Design an enzyme around this catalytic site. Structure first.
Site, PDB file in Angstrom:
ATOM      1  N   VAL A 142      11.416 -10.648 -53.895  1.00  0.00           N
ATOM      2  CA  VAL A 142      11.453  -9.104 -54.129  1.00  0.00           C
ATOM      3  C   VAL A 142      10.180  -8.685 -54.260  1.00  0.00           C
ATOM      4  O   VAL A 142       9.336  -9.406 -54.849  1.00  0.00           O
ATOM      5  CB  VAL A 142      12.597  -8.963 -55.404  1.00  0.00           C
ATOM      6  CG1 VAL A 142      11.718  -9.568 -56.534  1.00  0.00           C
ATOM      7  CG2 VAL A 142      12.386  -7.337 -55.726  1.00  0.00           C
ATOM      8  N   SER A 143       9.705  -7.502 -53.654  1.00  0.00           N
ATOM      9  CA  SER A 143       8.291  -7.175 -53.536  1.00  0.00           C
ATOM     10  C   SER A 143       7.876  -6.704 -54.851  1.00  0.00           C
ATOM     11  O   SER A 143       8.612  -6.424 -55.874  1.00  0.00           O
ATOM     12  CB  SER A 143       8.251  -6.002 -52.547  1.00  0.00           C
ATOM     13  OG  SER A 143       8.481  -6.500 -51.287  1.00  0.00           O
ATOM     14  N   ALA A 144       6.758  -6.645 -55.042  1.00  0.00           N
ATOM     15  CA  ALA A 144       5.914  -6.345 -56.151  1.00  0.00           C
ATOM     16  C   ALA A 144       6.241  -4.733 -56.336  1.00  0.00           C
ATOM     17  O   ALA A 144       6.241  -3.718 -55.619  1.00  0.00           O
ATOM     18  CB  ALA A 144       4.530  -6.289 -56.046  1.00  0.00           C
TER      19      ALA A 144
END
Ligand code: ADN
Ligand code: NA
Length: 215
Positions: free
Chosen positions: A61-63
């Site tokens: 899950v992206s930043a």
């Protein structure tokens, strides 16, 4: 709970103060759906840190800052028809739904993650997000055309199907690079005068695997 949310509030304030979150719409979405709701229990303690986190099936899950950047580029409005390619944890889809106030379509190629996302969404009380199992590099014809298509996996090129499925004046946000894991964030606008592209810098996303992505 309230403790996790307090740390999250600080992260949202930071993103706002630093000019990453630039609209009340994105701010509101972030505050309604904290990232800890979308990661496994063992990673919730780090959900507020502005860093990418692992999710099942070897994906991530992206930043928070990257998710914010992409939503802001999208300039989403209520009523828009949005397609997300790469559901993952379902976090981004939930955020999009809070902004557009209508049905959101998101595609995921890994069965385990389709289930993971659906569970996260249901647990959070989301109803407008529709997770579909499939190869999103082919878009999703049934509900095309779209105002914006947000791709959260890196491609080797701009998938033609995603361009075909965009409304005129719409845009495709996608990471494109000759490496499976290191890309350039592109804002591809389908204008009345043709394709216009704005490069938003280097990024690092898992690869978009499919017919119009990586083999
Ligand atoms: N062709 C594809 N269609 C839909 N989701 C994809 C595709 N390739 C990769 N993904 C997914 O992108 C997600 C990134 O948010 C990952 O969970 C990954 O499995
Ligand atoms: Na997400």
């Amino acid at each position: 709970e309230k403790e996790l949310y307090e740390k999250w509030m600080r992260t949202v304030e930071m993103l706002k103060a630093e000019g990453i979150i630039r609209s009340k719409e994105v701010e509101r979405a972030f505050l309604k759906y904290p990232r800890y709701l979308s990661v496994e229990d063992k990673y919730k303690k780090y959900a507020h840190i502005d860093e990418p986190l692992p999710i099942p099936a070897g994906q991530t899950v992206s930043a928070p800052h990257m998710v914010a950047i992409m939503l802001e580029i999208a300039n989403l409005k209520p009523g828009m028809n949005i397609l997300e390619v790469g559901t993952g944890s379902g976090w981004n889809a939930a955020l999009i739904s809070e902004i557009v106030k209508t049905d959101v379509y998101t595609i995921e190629r890994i069965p385990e993650l389709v289930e993971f996302a659906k569970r996260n969404l249901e647990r959070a009380g989301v109803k407008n997000v529709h997770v579909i199992l499939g190869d999103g590099s082919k878009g999703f014809p049934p509900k095309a055309p779209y105002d914006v298509i947000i791709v959260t996996a890196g491609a080797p090129k701009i998938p033609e199907p995603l361009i075909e499925q965009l409304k005129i004046g719409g845009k495709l946000i996608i990471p494109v690079g000759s490496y499976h894991l290191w890309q350039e964030l592109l804002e591809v606008r389908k204008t009345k005068d043709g394709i216009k592209i704005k490069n938003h810098g280097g990024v690092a996303f898992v690869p978009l695997i499919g017919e119009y992505g990586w083999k």
